[PDB]
PDB file of C-alpha atoms and ligand atoms in Angstrom:
ATOM      1  CA  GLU A 207    -230.157 106.217  17.950  1.00  0.00           C
ATOM      2  CA  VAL A 208    -227.569 106.681  20.709  1.00  0.00           C
ATOM      3  CA  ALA A 209    -224.663 104.224  20.720  1.00  0.00           C
ATOM      4  CA  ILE A 210    -222.899 103.472  24.016  1.00  0.00           C
ATOM      5  CA  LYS A 211    -219.633 101.546  24.222  1.00  0.00           C
ATOM      6  CA  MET A 212    -219.461  99.447  27.377  1.00  0.00           C
ATOM      7  CA  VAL A 213    -216.601  97.346  28.702  1.00  0.00           C
ATOM      8  CA  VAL A 214    -216.946  94.386  31.058  1.00  0.00           C
ATOM      9  CA  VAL A 215    -213.866  93.572  33.124  1.00  0.00           C
ATOM     10  CA  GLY A 216    -212.867  91.055  35.756  1.00  0.00           C
ATOM     11  CA  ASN A 217    -210.691  88.025  36.305  1.00  0.00           C
ATOM     12  CA  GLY A 218    -210.721  85.058  33.969  1.00  0.00           C
ATOM     13  CA  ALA A 219    -213.778  82.787  34.167  1.00  0.00           C
ATOM     14  CA  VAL A 220    -215.960  85.145  36.244  1.00  0.00           C
ATOM     15  CA  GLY A 221    -218.566  85.060  33.461  1.00  0.00           C
ATOM     16  CA  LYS A 222    -217.949  88.211  31.385  1.00  0.00           C
ATOM     17  CA  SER A 223    -218.565  86.538  28.025  1.00  0.00           C
ATOM     18  CA  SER A 224    -221.519  84.611  29.428  1.00  0.00           C
ATOM     19  CA  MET A 225    -223.091  87.852  30.693  1.00  0.00           C
ATOM     20  CA  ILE A 226    -222.658  89.634  27.360  1.00  0.00           C
ATOM     21  CA  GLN A 227    -223.839  86.678  25.267  1.00  0.00           C
ATOM     22  CA  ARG A 228    -226.870  86.084  27.493  1.00  0.00           C
ATOM     23  CA  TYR A 229    -227.829  89.750  27.190  1.00  0.00           C
ATOM     24  CA  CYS A 230    -227.261  90.062  23.438  1.00  0.00           C
ATOM     25  CA  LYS A 231    -228.049  86.556  22.150  1.00  0.00           C
ATOM     26  CA  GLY A 232    -230.219  84.984  24.863  1.00  0.00           C
ATOM     27  CA  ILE A 233    -228.117  81.856  25.440  1.00  0.00           C
ATOM     28  CA  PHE A 234    -225.898  80.292  28.088  1.00  0.00           C
ATOM     29  CA  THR A 235    -223.595  77.270  27.962  1.00  0.00           C
ATOM     30  CA  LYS A 236    -221.691  75.470  30.711  1.00  0.00           C
ATOM     31  CA  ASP A 237    -218.423  74.859  28.845  1.00  0.00           C
ATOM     32  CA  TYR A 238    -215.638  77.389  29.395  1.00  0.00           C
ATOM     33  CA  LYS A 239    -214.034  78.828  26.259  1.00  0.00           C
ATOM     34  CA  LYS A 240    -211.526  81.579  27.032  1.00  0.00           C
ATOM     35  CA  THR A 241    -212.203  84.649  24.919  1.00  0.00           C
ATOM     36  CA  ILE A 242    -209.972  85.117  21.868  1.00  0.00           C
ATOM     37  CA  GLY A 243    -208.999  88.675  21.000  1.00  0.00           C
ATOM     38  CA  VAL A 244    -211.855  91.151  21.341  1.00  0.00           C
ATOM     39  CA  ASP A 245    -215.439  90.143  20.570  1.00  0.00           C
ATOM     40  CA  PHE A 246    -218.054  92.779  19.746  1.00  0.00           C
ATOM     41  CA  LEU A 247    -221.706  92.194  20.602  1.00  0.00           C
ATOM     42  CA  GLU A 248    -224.613  94.601  20.524  1.00  0.00           C
ATOM     43  CA  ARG A 249    -228.191  95.001  21.672  1.00  0.00           C
ATOM     44  CA  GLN A 250    -230.759  97.633  20.727  1.00  0.00           C
ATOM     45  CA  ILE A 251    -233.000  98.676  23.626  1.00  0.00           C
ATOM     46  CA  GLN A 252    -235.351 101.516  24.528  1.00  0.00           C
ATOM     47  CA  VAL A 253    -234.451 103.970  27.298  1.00  0.00           C
ATOM     48  CA  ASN A 254    -237.284 106.429  27.939  1.00  0.00           C
ATOM     49  CA  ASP A 255    -238.206 107.688  24.466  1.00  0.00           C
ATOM     50  CA  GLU A 256    -234.938 106.960  22.661  1.00  0.00           C
ATOM     51  CA  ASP A 257    -233.440 104.091  20.692  1.00  0.00           C
ATOM     52  CA  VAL A 258    -230.168 102.994  22.305  1.00  0.00           C
ATOM     53  CA  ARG A 259    -227.605 100.563  20.888  1.00  0.00           C
ATOM     54  CA  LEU A 260    -225.315  99.064  23.533  1.00  0.00           C
ATOM     55  CA  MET A 261    -221.932  98.128  22.031  1.00  0.00           C
ATOM     56  CA  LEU A 262    -220.471  95.532  24.404  1.00  0.00           C
ATOM     57  CA  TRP A 263    -216.743  94.808  24.097  1.00  0.00           C
ATOM     58  CA  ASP A 264    -215.571  91.426  25.394  1.00  0.00           C
ATOM     59  CA  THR A 265    -212.008  90.259  26.045  1.00  0.00           C
ATOM     60  CA  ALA A 266    -210.282  87.718  28.271  1.00  0.00           C
ATOM     61  CA  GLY A 267    -209.460  88.749  31.823  1.00  0.00           C
ATOM     62  CA  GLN A 268    -206.160  86.900  32.269  1.00  0.00           C
ATOM     63  CA  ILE A 269    -205.342  94.163  27.890  1.00  0.00           C
ATOM     64  CA  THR A 270    -204.646  96.687  25.139  1.00  0.00           C
ATOM     65  CA  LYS A 271    -205.463 100.372  25.524  1.00  0.00           C
ATOM     66  CA  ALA A 272    -207.678 100.066  22.435  1.00  0.00           C
ATOM     67  CA  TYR A 273    -210.070  97.863  24.421  1.00  0.00           C
ATOM     68  CA  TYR A 274    -210.718 100.619  26.975  1.00  0.00           C
ATOM     69  CA  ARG A 275    -210.461 103.560  24.568  1.00  0.00           C
ATOM     70  CA  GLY A 276    -213.725 105.470  24.335  1.00  0.00           C
ATOM     71  CA  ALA A 277    -215.509 103.279  26.881  1.00  0.00           C
ATOM     72  CA  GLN A 278    -218.616 105.083  28.118  1.00  0.00           C
ATOM     73  CA  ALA A 279    -219.733 102.645  30.840  1.00  0.00           C
ATOM     74  CA  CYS A 280    -218.149  99.753  32.713  1.00  0.00           C
ATOM     75  CA  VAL A 281    -219.221  96.532  34.438  1.00  0.00           C
ATOM     76  CA  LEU A 282    -216.823  95.272  37.131  1.00  0.00           C
ATOM     77  CA  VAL A 283    -217.447  91.535  37.590  1.00  0.00           C
ATOM     78  CA  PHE A 284    -216.313  89.071  40.221  1.00  0.00           C
ATOM     79  CA  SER A 285    -217.457  85.492  40.794  1.00  0.00           C
ATOM     80  CA  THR A 286    -219.307  84.089  43.807  1.00  0.00           C
ATOM     81  CA  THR A 287    -216.924  81.099  43.741  1.00  0.00           C
ATOM     82  CA  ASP A 288    -213.578  82.894  43.228  1.00  0.00           C
ATOM     83  CA  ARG A 289    -212.142  84.892  46.132  1.00  0.00           C
ATOM     84  CA  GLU A 290    -209.225  86.149  44.037  1.00  0.00           C
ATOM     85  CA  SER A 291    -211.683  87.643  41.548  1.00  0.00           C
ATOM     86  CA  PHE A 292    -213.308  89.586  44.397  1.00  0.00           C
ATOM     87  CA  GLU A 293    -209.962  90.787  45.750  1.00  0.00           C
ATOM     88  CA  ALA A 294    -209.021  91.990  42.247  1.00  0.00           C
ATOM     89  CA  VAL A 295    -212.036  94.324  41.877  1.00  0.00           C
ATOM     90  CA  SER A 296    -210.194  97.442  43.061  1.00  0.00           C
ATOM     91  CA  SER A 297    -207.311  96.709  40.678  1.00  0.00           C
ATOM     92  CA  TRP A 298    -209.749  96.461  37.765  1.00  0.00           C
ATOM     93  CA  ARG A 299    -211.482  99.672  38.861  1.00  0.00           C
ATOM     94  CA  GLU A 300    -208.186 101.564  38.906  1.00  0.00           C
ATOM     95  CA  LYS A 301    -207.205 100.160  35.500  1.00  0.00           C
ATOM     96  CA  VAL A 302    -210.405 101.516  33.956  1.00  0.00           C
ATOM     97  CA  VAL A 303    -210.096 104.894  35.689  1.00  0.00           C
ATOM     98  CA  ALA A 304    -206.498 105.255  34.498  1.00  0.00           C
ATOM     99  CA  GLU A 305    -207.660 104.738  30.899  1.00  0.00           C
ATOM    100  CA  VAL A 306    -210.938 106.681  30.630  1.00  0.00           C
ATOM    101  CA  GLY A 307    -211.390 108.569  33.898  1.00  0.00           C
ATOM    102  CA  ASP A 308    -214.828 108.761  35.524  1.00  0.00           C
ATOM    103  CA  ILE A 309    -217.494 106.798  33.635  1.00  0.00           C
ATOM    104  CA  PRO A 310    -220.719 105.145  34.838  1.00  0.00           C
ATOM    105  CA  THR A 311    -219.743 101.890  36.528  1.00  0.00           C
ATOM    106  CA  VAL A 312    -221.566  99.030  38.246  1.00  0.00           C
ATOM    107  CA  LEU A 313    -220.310  96.198  40.457  1.00  0.00           C
ATOM    108  CA  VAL A 314    -221.584  92.687  39.707  1.00  0.00           C
ATOM    109  CA  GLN A 315    -221.257  89.474  41.704  1.00  0.00           C
ATOM    110  CA  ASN A 316    -221.923  86.770  39.123  1.00  0.00           C
ATOM    111  CA  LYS A 317    -222.681  83.049  39.581  1.00  0.00           C
ATOM    112  CA  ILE A 318    -225.026  83.766  42.493  1.00  0.00           C
ATOM    113  CA  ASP A 319    -226.727  80.430  41.729  1.00  0.00           C
ATOM    114  CA  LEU A 320    -223.584  78.754  43.154  1.00  0.00           C
ATOM    115  CA  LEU A 321    -224.197  80.163  46.643  1.00  0.00           C
ATOM    116  CA  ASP A 322    -223.299  76.800  48.218  1.00  0.00           C
ATOM    117  CA  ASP A 323    -219.699  77.259  46.988  1.00  0.00           C
ATOM    118  CA  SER A 324    -219.575  80.961  47.870  1.00  0.00           C
ATOM    119  CA  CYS A 325    -216.262  82.538  48.891  1.00  0.00           C
ATOM    120  CA  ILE A 326    -217.684  86.026  49.576  1.00  0.00           C
ATOM    121  CA  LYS A 327    -220.124  86.857  52.359  1.00  0.00           C
ATOM    122  CA  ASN A 328    -223.047  89.119  51.487  1.00  0.00           C
ATOM    123  CA  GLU A 329    -221.765  91.735  53.934  1.00  0.00           C
ATOM    124  CA  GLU A 330    -218.313  91.725  52.305  1.00  0.00           C
ATOM    125  CA  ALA A 331    -219.704  92.305  48.811  1.00  0.00           C
ATOM    126  CA  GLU A 332    -221.937  95.102  50.090  1.00  0.00           C
ATOM    127  CA  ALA A 333    -219.020  96.647  51.995  1.00  0.00           C
ATOM    128  CA  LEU A 334    -216.990  96.711  48.778  1.00  0.00           C
ATOM    129  CA  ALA A 335    -219.866  98.330  46.874  1.00  0.00           C
ATOM    130  CA  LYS A 336    -220.102 101.031  49.546  1.00  0.00           C
ATOM    131  CA  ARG A 337    -216.344 101.648  49.643  1.00  0.00           C
ATOM    132  CA  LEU A 338    -216.177 101.978  45.846  1.00  0.00           C
ATOM    133  CA  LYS A 339    -219.411 104.040  45.795  1.00  0.00           C
ATOM    134  CA  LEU A 340    -220.952 101.750  43.171  1.00  0.00           C
ATOM    135  CA  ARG A 341    -224.377 100.287  42.548  1.00  0.00           C
ATOM    136  CA  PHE A 342    -224.203  96.530  43.118  1.00  0.00           C
ATOM    137  CA  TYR A 343    -226.078  93.651  41.464  1.00  0.00           C
ATOM    138  CA  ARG A 344    -225.953  89.920  42.127  1.00  0.00           C
ATOM    139  CA  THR A 345    -226.412  88.065  38.841  1.00  0.00           C
ATOM    140  CA  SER A 346    -226.798  84.532  37.570  1.00  0.00           C
ATOM    141  CA  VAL A 347    -226.232  84.231  33.838  1.00  0.00           C
ATOM    142  CA  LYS A 348    -227.292  80.585  34.113  1.00  0.00           C
ATOM    143  CA  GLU A 349    -230.683  81.552  35.579  1.00  0.00           C
ATOM    144  CA  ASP A 350    -230.934  84.851  33.637  1.00  0.00           C
ATOM    145  CA  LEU A 351    -231.232  86.823  36.888  1.00  0.00           C
ATOM    146  CA  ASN A 352    -230.415  90.565  36.892  1.00  0.00           C
ATOM    147  CA  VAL A 353    -228.360  90.574  33.674  1.00  0.00           C
ATOM    148  CA  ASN A 354    -230.823  92.858  31.876  1.00  0.00           C
ATOM    149  CA  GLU A 355    -230.934  95.197  34.873  1.00  0.00           C
ATOM    150  CA  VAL A 356    -227.139  95.614  34.953  1.00  0.00           C
ATOM    151  CA  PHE A 357    -226.962  96.939  31.402  1.00  0.00           C
ATOM    152  CA  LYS A 358    -230.175  98.963  31.717  1.00  0.00           C
ATOM    153  CA  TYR A 359    -228.717 100.718  34.767  1.00  0.00           C
ATOM    154  CA  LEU A 360    -225.550 101.674  32.890  1.00  0.00           C
ATOM    155  CA  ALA A 361    -227.485 102.881  29.845  1.00  0.00           C
ATOM    156  CA  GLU A 362    -229.754 105.036  32.014  1.00  0.00           C
ATOM    157  CA  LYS A 363    -226.801 106.441  33.960  1.00  0.00           C
ATOM    158  CA  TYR A 364    -224.954 107.388  30.770  1.00  0.00           C
ATOM    159  CA  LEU A 365    -228.005 109.094  29.257  1.00  0.00           C
ATOM    160  CA  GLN A 366    -228.625 111.052  32.478  1.00  0.00           C
TER     161      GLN A 366
HETATM  162  N1  GNP B 947    -223.158  78.405  37.459  1.00  0.00           N
HETATM  163  C1  GNP B 947    -222.814  79.446  36.697  1.00  0.00           C
HETATM  164  N2  GNP B 947    -221.813  79.323  35.828  1.00  0.00           N
HETATM  165  C2  GNP B 947    -221.586  80.456  35.137  1.00  0.00           C
HETATM  166  C3  GNP B 947    -222.251  81.659  35.226  1.00  0.00           C
HETATM  167  N3  GNP B 947    -221.702  82.582  34.351  1.00  0.00           N
HETATM  168  C4  GNP B 947    -220.730  81.930  33.757  1.00  0.00           C
HETATM  169  N4  GNP B 947    -220.607  80.636  34.190  1.00  0.00           N
HETATM  170  C5  GNP B 947    -219.600  79.646  33.787  1.00  0.00           C
HETATM  171  O1  GNP B 947    -218.322  80.161  34.109  1.00  0.00           O
HETATM  172  C6  GNP B 947    -217.358  79.725  33.124  1.00  0.00           C
HETATM  173  C7  GNP B 947    -216.609  80.915  32.575  1.00  0.00           C
HETATM  174  O2  GNP B 947    -217.552  81.760  31.885  1.00  0.00           O
HETATM  175  P1  GNP B 947    -217.049  82.812  30.795  1.00  0.00           P
HETATM  176  O3  GNP B 947    -218.242  83.603  30.429  1.00  0.00           O
HETATM  177  O4  GNP B 947    -216.248  82.142  29.739  1.00  0.00           O
HETATM  178  O5  GNP B 947    -216.053  83.720  31.654  1.00  0.00           O
HETATM  179  P2  GNP B 947    -215.096  84.952  31.216  1.00  0.00           P
HETATM  180  O6  GNP B 947    -215.071  85.966  32.292  1.00  0.00           O
HETATM  181  O7  GNP B 947    -215.614  85.457  29.908  1.00  0.00           O
HETATM  182  N5  GNP B 947    -213.613  84.274  31.013  1.00  0.00           N
HETATM  183  P3  GNP B 947    -212.321  84.831  30.145  1.00  0.00           P
HETATM  184  O8  GNP B 947    -211.901  86.039  30.901  1.00  0.00           O
HETATM  185  O9  GNP B 947    -211.294  83.755  30.172  1.00  0.00           O
HETATM  186  O10 GNP B 947    -212.728  85.174  28.770  1.00  0.00           O
HETATM  187  C8  GNP B 947    -218.134  78.893  32.101  1.00  0.00           C
HETATM  188  O11 GNP B 947    -218.007  77.509  32.409  1.00  0.00           O
HETATM  189  C9  GNP B 947    -219.575  79.374  32.288  1.00  0.00           C
HETATM  190  O12 GNP B 947    -220.525  78.363  31.964  1.00  0.00           O
HETATM  191  C10 GNP B 947    -223.321  81.776  36.164  1.00  0.00           C
HETATM  192  O13 GNP B 947    -224.013  82.771  36.379  1.00  0.00           O
HETATM  193  N6  GNP B 947    -223.531  80.602  36.863  1.00  0.00           N
HETATM  194 MG1   MG B 948    -214.614  85.550  28.046  1.00  0.00          MG
END
């Protein structure tokens, strides 16, 4: 079994904990509880012909070097309804790079079910993905849309 440590970063309330808990535990709740300390969740999946255990590290976005240390893949998350979270993506990217260098990374626009309150045009999100040279997924944790694919992509990229 191959273990992969993955970090998930982004501004407060973008849905980092919701993403991780949906992926690992299959649930979603509407109430916002800011993450306390660092929470460790895991999921065992199959990639090709190999058992893989994804070790997902969760912490609040509003961070110690120990959180990033040894990270092998990274999700950069912003929220459909939070322009500041989108503007902060580059800052989060550079924070991760400064800690661990070049690791497989993916850009995620979460809360896509709230498109009526969107603060980011589709073309702006895609322009950011291109400028950062990152694969881009639109997710809804509430609807369980594309969450599995985000983590599968990172696991496949690490193993390749
Ligand atoms: N409509 C909708 N709400 C979502 C979605 N994902 C998360 N939320 C909501 O957004 C709020 C914040 O989610 P949470 O996962 O705690 O965010 P976080 O990035 O972990 N925050 P923190 O950095 O403070 O720990 C919660 O009210 C949660 O229900 C989504 O895809 N759609
Ligand atoms: Mg959280």
